[PDB]
Design a protein around this ligand. Sequence first.
Ligand SMILES: OC[C@H]1O[C@H](O[C@H]2[C@@H](O)[C@@H](O)[C@H](OCCCCCCC3CCCCC3)O[C@@H]2CO)[C@@H](O)[C@@H](O)[C@@H]1O
Ligand SMILES: *C(=O)/C=C/N[C@@H](C(=O)O)[C@](C)(Cn1ccnn1)[SH](=O)=O
Ligand SMILES: C[C@]1(Cn2ccnn2)[C@H](C(=O)O)N2C(=O)C[C@H]2S1(=O)=O
Length: 265
Amino acid sequence: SPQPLEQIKLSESQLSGRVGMIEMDLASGRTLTAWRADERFPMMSTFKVVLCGAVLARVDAGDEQLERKIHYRQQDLVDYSPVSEKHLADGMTVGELCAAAITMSDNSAANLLLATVGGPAGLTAFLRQIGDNVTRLDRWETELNEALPGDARDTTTPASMAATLRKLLTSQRLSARSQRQLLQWMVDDRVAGPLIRSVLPAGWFIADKTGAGERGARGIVALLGPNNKAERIVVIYLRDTPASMAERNQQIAGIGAALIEHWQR
Ligand SMILES: OC[C@H]1O[C@H](O[C@H]2[C@@H](O)[C@@H](O)[C@H](OCCCCCCC3CCCCC3)O[C@@H]2CO)[C@@H](O)[C@@H](O)[C@@H]1O
Ligand SMILES: *C(=O)/C=C/N[C@@H](C(=O)O)[C@](C)(Cn1ccnn1)[SH](=O)=O
Ligand SMILES: C[C@]1(Cn2ccnn2)[C@H](C(=O)O)N2C(=O)C[C@H]2S1(=O)=O
């Protein structure tokens, strides 16, 4: 593989699209390498990780319980609800909703949860309170994946998403059990985890959340590192390319490959 930024260029040139990337130490926030890290990109389903971060914050403040059962109707469902569509009679706990939303990318589960923290407004307030002054959620599923050119709604920057995930996973913002729960959800991803784990070299830890949207929007936020440890946060977004999903998948894999092959101390 080529060096990581060389691979990143090649990808932008082949896709005719923008790539954004940061590789950061989870423990300190040391930035190892970055590319359009301060440019905005639609978050897509990657926001589900931050959303469950806010739910955990509510559980920690005594405002919410992972066990609280929520009951919802058929009329509340939205597109792609592989888990939530199966529990119309029995409802789902707040904890199950976060696992469906992060590990299966269930969209109704995300919506039901979004209502509990005050909707997109309330999730943007939580970010501001955590010191993220860039990320902004403004719409619900599935409209938040719309990705129009130059629209800042429902977008983040690579470096702002990395700094926020680091704060949720390691500062004293979430209790320790909550930090561990947020982490375990991403480890248990069922959409791309297994696939990715199977092609990674032996020794590599992987936790992730992937997303896709319109106009070629594609992305992943992940915990990765050699020696079976969640060493660094890697955030890769792609936007404004006409390419097929398969090509978009391969290009992000090729950058991931480059990143992994040329990993620095
Ligand atoms: O780094 C050296 C290694 O190079 C090869 O592995 C390749 C290759 O087998 C590939 O499949 C994979 O990435 C493929 C999948 C990348 C998916 C990453 C996408 C996500 C991953 C986590 C966040 C970044 C983006 O890595 C490497 C690096 O060249 C193998 O020889 C392996 O034995 C060896 O240990
Ligand atoms: C996370 O990224 C959820 C988005 N997926 C979209 C998509 O692939 O673009 C689906 C198909 C739902 N949706 C959003 C916009 N249009 N449909 S699905 O994965 O929920
Ligand atoms: C999620 C699904 C229905 N679907 C499509 C769009 N929104 N919902 C359906 C299900 O589990 O309900 N699954 C299949 O069966 C394959 C997948 S799916 O992607 O066909």
